[PDB]
Amino acid sequence: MVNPTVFFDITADDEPLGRVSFELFADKVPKTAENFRALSTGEKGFGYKGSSFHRIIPGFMCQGGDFTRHNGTGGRSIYGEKFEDENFILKHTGPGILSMANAGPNTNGSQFFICTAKTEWLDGKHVVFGKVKEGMNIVEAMERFGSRNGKTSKKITISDCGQLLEHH
């Protein structure tokens, strides 16, 4: 199967920045890809729509996915519990990598980050499961609203999200 594609429409203080899309590596990490895909469509009645990037570190990453507590303490998977690290096949090779945030081994929920640089020191600690396809310049624009402690100077929000059913 061709890997699935998700999109996020991003706003900064409610003004549209545009659309970011991701390839999800379901051919390598199917359980991790499916959790992020389902949270992006809203088909379970909860998920990423309306949530924000609560920690943005210029030069390194944009972290989001905490749709329950909005601060790095919340979020939940589609599996009813935190789930295992599926594998570490893929590495943090450069800008655009999409990887799971976690609280240590086998604690995946819904939080994730988008790298804005190669972050090889995260290899083997976070499951890499996708990569930006379109919209890397929007992630670079997002990164500019961050700060050394991750606090954002504008609210960076997933105003809409879903799956792209065709890939062209």
Are 10 and 142 a contacting pair, CB within 8 Å? yes
Cα gap 73→7, rounded to integer Å:
24
Q: How far is C-alpha 55 from the chain's CA centre? A: 12
Tokens of 151: 């606090």
**Domain range for 25:** 1-168
Question: 47 by DSSP, 3-state: which?
Answer: coil
Cα gap 155→161, rounded to integer Å:
17
Beta bridge partners of 79: none
Catalytic residue among 102, 111, 112, 145: 102
Describe the chain by its helix, strand, coil percentages, rounded to 5: 15, 30, 55
**Looking at beta carbons, which pairs linking 27-30 to residues 24 or more positions away fall under 8 Å?**
27/1, 27/3, 28/87, 28/89, 28/90, 28/129, 29/86, 29/87, 29/89, 29/90, 29/127, 29/128, 29/129, 30/86
Amino acid identity, residue 136?
Answer: M
CA dihedral defined by 83, 126, 163, 45, rounded to 10 degrees?
Answer: 40
Are 83 and 108 a contacting pair, CB within 8 Å? yes
Q: How far is C-alpha 129 from the chain's CA centre? A: 9
Catalytic residue among 3, 35, 63, 111: 63
Amino acid identity, residue 166?
Answer: E
Are 167 and 26 a contacting pair, CB within 8 Å? no
Catalytic residue among 54, 76, 92, 126: 126
Beta bridge partners of 11: 16, 157
Provide the experimental method for this PDB entry: X-ray
Angle at 89 (CA atoms; ends 61, 67), nearest 5 degrees: 40
Resolution, given in Å to one decimal, reads 1.3
Cα gap 32→28, rounded to integer Å:
9
Beta bridge partners of 99: 113, 128
Are 37 and 4 a contacting pair, CB within 8 Å? yes
Active site annotation includes 126: yes
| Cβ-based neighbour number of residue 86 at 10 Å | 17
Q: What is the DSSP letter of 133?
A: -
Report the number of distinct structural domains present in the chain: 1
**Residue burial 117-149, b: 16+ Cβ < 10 Å; e: rest:** bebeebeeebbbbbbbbebbebbeebbebbeee
Residue 137: CATH number of its domain? 2.40.100.10
As to burial, measured by CB atoms within 10 angstroms (0-12 exposed, 13-18 middle, 19+ buried), residue 58 is: middle
Catalytic residue among 54, 55, 76, 92: 55
Active site annotation includes 113: yes
Q: How far is C-alpha 38 from the chain's CA centre? A: 13
